[PDB]
Design a binder for this molecule. Sequence first.
Ligand SMILES: *[C@@H]1O[C@H](CO)[C@@H](O[C@@H]2O[C@H](CO)[C@@H](O[C@@H]3O[C@H](CO[C@H]4O[C@H](CO[C@H]5O[C@H](CO)[C@@H](O)[C@H](O)[C@@H]5O)[C@@H](O)[C@H](O[C@H]5O[C@H](CO)[C@@H](O)[C@H](O)[C@@H]5O)[C@@H]4O)[C@@H](O)[C@H](O[C@H]4O[C@H](CO)[C@@H](O)[C@H](O)[C@@H]4O)[C@@H]3O)[C@H](O)[C@H]2NC(C)=O)[C@H](O)[C@H]1NC(C)=O
Ligand SMILES: *[C@@H]1O[C@H](CO)[C@@H](O[C@@H]2O[C@H](CO)[C@@H](O[C@@H]3O[C@H](CO[C@H]4O[C@H](CO)[C@@H](O)[C@H](O)[C@@H]4O)[C@@H](O)[C@H](O[C@H]4O[C@H](CO)[C@@H](O)[C@H](O)[C@@H]4O)[C@@H]3O)[C@H](O)[C@H]2NC(C)=O)[C@H](O)[C@H]1NC(C)=O
Ligand code: HEM
Ligand SMILES: C/C=C/C(=O)[C@@H]1C(C)=CCCC1(C)C
Ligand SMILES: [Mg+2]
Length: 335
Amino acid sequence: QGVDPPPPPGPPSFTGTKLVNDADHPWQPLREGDIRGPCPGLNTLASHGYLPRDGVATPAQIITATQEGFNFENNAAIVATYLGHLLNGNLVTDLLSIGGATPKTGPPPPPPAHAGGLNVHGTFEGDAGMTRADEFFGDNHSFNQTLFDKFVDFSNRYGGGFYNLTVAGELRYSRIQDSIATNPEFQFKNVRFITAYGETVFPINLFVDGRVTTDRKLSMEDAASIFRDMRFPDDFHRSAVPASNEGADQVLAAHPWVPGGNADNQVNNYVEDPDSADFTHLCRLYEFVVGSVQELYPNPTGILRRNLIKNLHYWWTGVNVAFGGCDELFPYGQL
Ligand SMILES: *[C@@H]1O[C@H](CO)[C@@H](O[C@@H]2O[C@H](CO)[C@@H](O[C@@H]3O[C@H](CO[C@H]4O[C@H](CO[C@H]5O[C@H](CO)[C@@H](O)[C@H](O)[C@@H]5O)[C@@H](O)[C@H](O[C@H]5O[C@H](CO)[C@@H](O)[C@H](O)[C@@H]5O)[C@@H]4O)[C@@H](O)[C@H](O[C@H]4O[C@H](CO)[C@@H](O)[C@H](O)[C@@H]4O)[C@@H]3O)[C@H](O)[C@H]2NC(C)=O)[C@H](O)[C@H]1NC(C)=O
Ligand SMILES: *[C@@H]1O[C@H](CO)[C@@H](O[C@@H]2O[C@H](CO)[C@@H](O[C@@H]3O[C@H](CO[C@H]4O[C@H](CO)[C@@H](O)[C@H](O)[C@@H]4O)[C@@H](O)[C@H](O[C@H]4O[C@H](CO)[C@@H](O)[C@H](O)[C@@H]4O)[C@@H]3O)[C@H](O)[C@H]2NC(C)=O)[C@H](O)[C@H]1NC(C)=O
Ligand code: HEM
Ligand SMILES: C/C=C/C(=O)[C@@H]1C(C)=CCCC1(C)C
Ligand SMILES: [Mg+2]
């Protein structure tokens, strides 16, 4: 009949570097029913047992895993986790698939809500990723070797064979151009516009070993290990400080860009959206997402309503800090 969802964990007691690829967290191959998805971070944590190996977890487990495994900053973990859960998780059972649909999240919610996992396109997951192809081409979750080859190419061209912040600036823009030219349904606004810049620096701030203090750069072996094999590098030590999206500002500055999309189902037809969230208008993202939640849950009652209210509030606690102050919305009132 359902779960009473606890408030998110706070920051880890210990925030220094440590060995995360350790004896208690061995890489293991997928079993039947194991779920993986578009996030290499969560994929790696599942394949090393920081998350349940089946790829279905509670928000709390996801937060603690991103902190333990990678030293993902607490508020960043809260913003990402409850966004993913509100849109893509089962709020009654308190379970989120890090990939596609699975019986493991329990009894489905009332449509149009789906609990279909992070694979679901269009509000969270979106286009112009680094190692995953746009949903328009048929597969938004699998590793794509051609895209990784371009990652390697750009690292060779701008990063001395390593992925660093200069590479990120160039790759991000080029991937936007690929999608403009080839994807008639290309959207790059709202959540996706914001998350697309952060994801390009996560490899630098989080996938680079934490003992490397200076000239942080990711090797292609380590990139392949994580992005393709869902495997931590041997002897991997997490970031020495809580981190998230440091440097995302510089990635945008290298090639200034404006939220929007290809209009009228045509390539090479990018039109700007002036209503979208952007980096100086972050609270729009909060309002947009609360709107999206109302579309998914038009008239909840009982445990569903209760859990919506709590998750919405938990999300806001993170958003309020991360976005520098947003007025809390109460689409379902109070408990
Ligand atoms: C991601 O990874 C990539 C790849 O590793 C990395 O790229 C490095 O980025 C740094 C910058 O952050 C680069 O270093 C800088 O290079 C600048 C450009 O250098 C060229 O021009 C120099 C200036 O020449 C003057 O004089 C000549 C006359 O000789 C004149 O014609 C010119 O017009 C100009 O006026 C030149 O000196 C330099 O050539 C020297 O070095 C090369 C070896 O690379 C050698 O072949 C030459 O014989 C010569 O010895 C080159 O052609 C440069 O301007 C800049 O200099 C500043 O800093 C130094 C030291 O800090 C100061 O002494 C100086 O006053 C300047 O303020 C600096 O050296 C580096 O080259 C990149 N490496 C590669 C491989 O591309 C990214 O940074 C990484 N990103 C992140 C975020 O980490
Ligand atoms: C892994 O991910 C890769 C990269 O995203 C996928 O490959 C892409 O696949 C799409 C769809 O097949 C390709 O899109 C098509 O591009 C054509 C233009 O290609 C030229 O230009 C690009 C660069 O601008 C070059 O890279 C490329 O080699 C060519 O020289 C267009 O003509 C196509 O458009 C037609 O159809 C659309 C849709 O209906 C219409 O709207 C158009 O008007 C038009 O008629 C189309 O967009 C794309 O080029 C591929 N990129 C690369 C780099 O290969 C893989 O599919 C995927 N791998 C697997 C197995 O999943
Ligand atoms: C905290 C909860 C997390 C959630 C809910 C989450 C969710 C997602 C989703 C949905 C995507 C797909 C992006 C898209 O196609 O638009 C994504 C991509 C990504 N995530 Fe995560 N993520 C989380 C944590 C992390 C962590 C801790 C890291 C790094 C350790 C990470 C690294 C990445 C990277 C690099 C990508 C880009 C993949 C690519 O474009 O090839 N994420 N994440
Ligand atoms: C998976 C990525 C999440 C993000 O980039 C977050 C959002 C949604 C906005 C501000 C930055 C950050 C908290 C990292
Ligand atoms: Mg994507």
